[PDB]
Write a protein that binds this ligand. Structure first.
Ligand SMILES: *[C@@H]1O[C@H](CO)[C@@H](O)[C@H](O)[C@H]1NC(C)=O
Ligand SMILES: *[C@@H]1O[C@H](CO)[C@@H](O)[C@H](O)[C@H]1NC(C)=O
Ligand SMILES: *[C@@H]1O[C@H](CO)[C@@H](O)[C@H](O)[C@H]1NC(C)=O
Length: 247
């Protein structure tokens, strides 16, 4: 695997080192406003990196991540791989976990689909170390009725934390006790592509966003980000979705 993390003996520093390693494992040819810009495209196997995760009992699964968007495609346990039911995952299955028995999951990997499958919205799914441990166990034995919920936990704990310092911070605060994420965290998840797009457009607009991005803050209030001097841009977002993959 290109990156790996083990919950056994982990603390806030080992988690942060892992997230930092995930961010550096993603290819990038340039930075925009000091933030690494993801590749507009990649071909073959080079389009994916592998992330190995082990729970407290040392049971491990390996997940494949699409480097152009940090989306999880599927995962491998024993000699069976499971991929989301969507075209990008179907393509990924042609290049990773070669030789494994490929199982197609009954849902795609976007949040709306996963929430419906799990029967619960992100606002009510606890995150933290024990939740992470529990999610890995569910996928390790492929408990089909818990998989969607397990993906919701893992995606936010890895992919979303790699995209935003604030979300990385949310997991750290939840190490001693699981707790649902804040509305602010979910707001950043939903606006990642919009923020990525505006930061790139701002480059030929003297730092100002063409269209303000609206999120909600830690106090539950509506806040507008309209320029690259915002704290969200200088000290929060850590990866940018390439504009060619937005609109
Ligand atoms: C990820 O690991 C694979 C397998 O060793 C390697 O071929 C590939 O170059 C790595 N990708 C990156 C960008 O680290
Ligand atoms: C995947 O989704 C398609 C519709 O987009 C459906 O026809 C197919 O049966 C699904 N496969 C699985 C594994 O559920
Ligand atoms: C993988 O093998 C382990 C050890 O036999 C087993 O506990 C686990 O359920 C298997 N996972 C799947 C999804 O088959």
């Amino acid at each position: 695997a290109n990156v790996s993390f083990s919950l056994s003996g982990a603390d806030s520093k080992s988690y942060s080192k892992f997230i930092t390693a995930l961010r550096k494992a993603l290819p990038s040819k340039e930075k925009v406003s000091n933030i690494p810009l993801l590749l507009p495209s990649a071909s073959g196997a080079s389009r994916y990196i592998l992330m190995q995760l082990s729970n407290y009992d040392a049971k491990a699964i390996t997940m494949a991540i699409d480097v152009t968007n940090v989306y999880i495609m599927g995962y491998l346990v024993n000699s069976t791989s499971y991929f989301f039911n969507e075209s990008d995952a179907k393509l990924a299955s042609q290049y990773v976990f070669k030789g494994s028995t490929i199982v197609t999951l009954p849902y795609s990997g976007n949040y709306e689909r996963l929430q419906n499958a799990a029967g619960k919205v992100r606002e009510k799914i606890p995150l933290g170390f024990r939740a992470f441990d529990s999610a890995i166990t569910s996928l390790f034995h492929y408990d089909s009725t818990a998989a969607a919920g397990a993906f919701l936990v893992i995606i936010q704990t890895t992919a979303e934390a790699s995209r935003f310092k604030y979300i990385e911070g949310q997991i750290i605060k939840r190490i001693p006790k699981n707790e649902v994420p804040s509305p602010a965290a979910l707001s950043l998840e939903n606006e990642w592509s919009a923020l990525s797009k505006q930061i790139q457009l701002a480059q030929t607009n003297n730092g100002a966003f063409r269209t303000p991005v609206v999120i909600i803050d830690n106090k539950g209030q509506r806040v507008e980000i309209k320029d690259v001097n915002s704290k969200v841009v200088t000290n929060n977002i850590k990866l940018l979705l390439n504009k060619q993959n937005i609109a």
